[PDB]
Amino acid sequence: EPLAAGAVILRRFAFNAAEQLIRDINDVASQSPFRQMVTPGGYTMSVAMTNCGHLGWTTHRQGYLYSPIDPQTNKPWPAMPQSFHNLCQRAATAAGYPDFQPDACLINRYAPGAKLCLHQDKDEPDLRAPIVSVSLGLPAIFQFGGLKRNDPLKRLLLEHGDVVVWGGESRLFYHGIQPLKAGFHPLTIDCRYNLTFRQAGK
DNA sequence: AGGTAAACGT
DNA sequence: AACGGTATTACCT
Ligand SMILES: [Fe+3]
């Protein structure tokens, strides 16, 4: 049974690419460090984040924004690594979205206990493009729901190298991550990373 | 008029 | 601990 209309899980799709992806995460974060962003309402998110590509997702006093500039460094986000772009391209193609051209990659880091409450991806001006989401490291329980927050959730363990793609009918579905269980992974040691690719600009 | 933010109790 | 209230509002543009 497929994940949803327009949505697919490609299990271990990025397994072979994972070590390089992780090297590139570290490179990105060396320029735009992981930070736990503060919501408009004043709470510090449990997931630490950074971005690469032309646009990066950020919070600010007034809301959320995709910005060409990292508000912490006041410099552009690091360029999207070729490994990221290539893996995204292959995954998108395998998932039935051969024309996807991301201009934004949000990198999430989960420590034990870190979570991401249900939310929608809908801040992009062009909602025709899918989201490609790559899991690395420790396993996490991904919630994938529907258009409304109370729509029943599917709960999927996402393991190292799993890639999830949603778009078309499921593009705006709610999704989240349940508090990360402590554990060990040989590549990430004690955390989980996620890469979310988007087309956030024109 | 619409778009926005949302991350405690049971 | 899975589920759902809260934004059922108060502001912007
Ligand atoms: Fe999301």
What CATH number is given to the structural domain containing A125? 2.60.120.590
Q: How far is the CA of A153 from the centre of ligand 1 (A)?
A: 14
On whether the CB atoms of residues A146 and A202 are closer than 8 A, the answer is no
Q: Which two tokens stand for residue A30?
A: 């060396």
Q: How far is the CA of A164 from the centre of ligand 1 (A)?
A: 11
Please compute Rg for chain A using Cα positions: 15
Cα separation, A182 vs A58, whole angstroms: 27
On whether the CB atoms of residues A68 and A103 are closer than 8 A, the answer is no
Residue range of the domain that includes A147: 1-202
Quoted resolution (Å): 1.5
Method used experimentally: X-ray
How many CB atoms within 10 Å of residue A134?
Answer: 27
On whether the CB atoms of residues A170 and A121 are closer than 8 A, the answer is no
Count of structural domains within chain A:
1
Cα separation, A16 vs A52, whole angstroms: 21
Binding site for 2-oxoglutarate: residue ranges of A? Answer: 108-110, 192-198
Minimum CA–C1' distance nucleotide for A116: B7
Residue A20: HSE in the Cβ half-sphere, 13 Å Cα cutoff? 11
Distance A135 CA to C6 C1' (A): 31
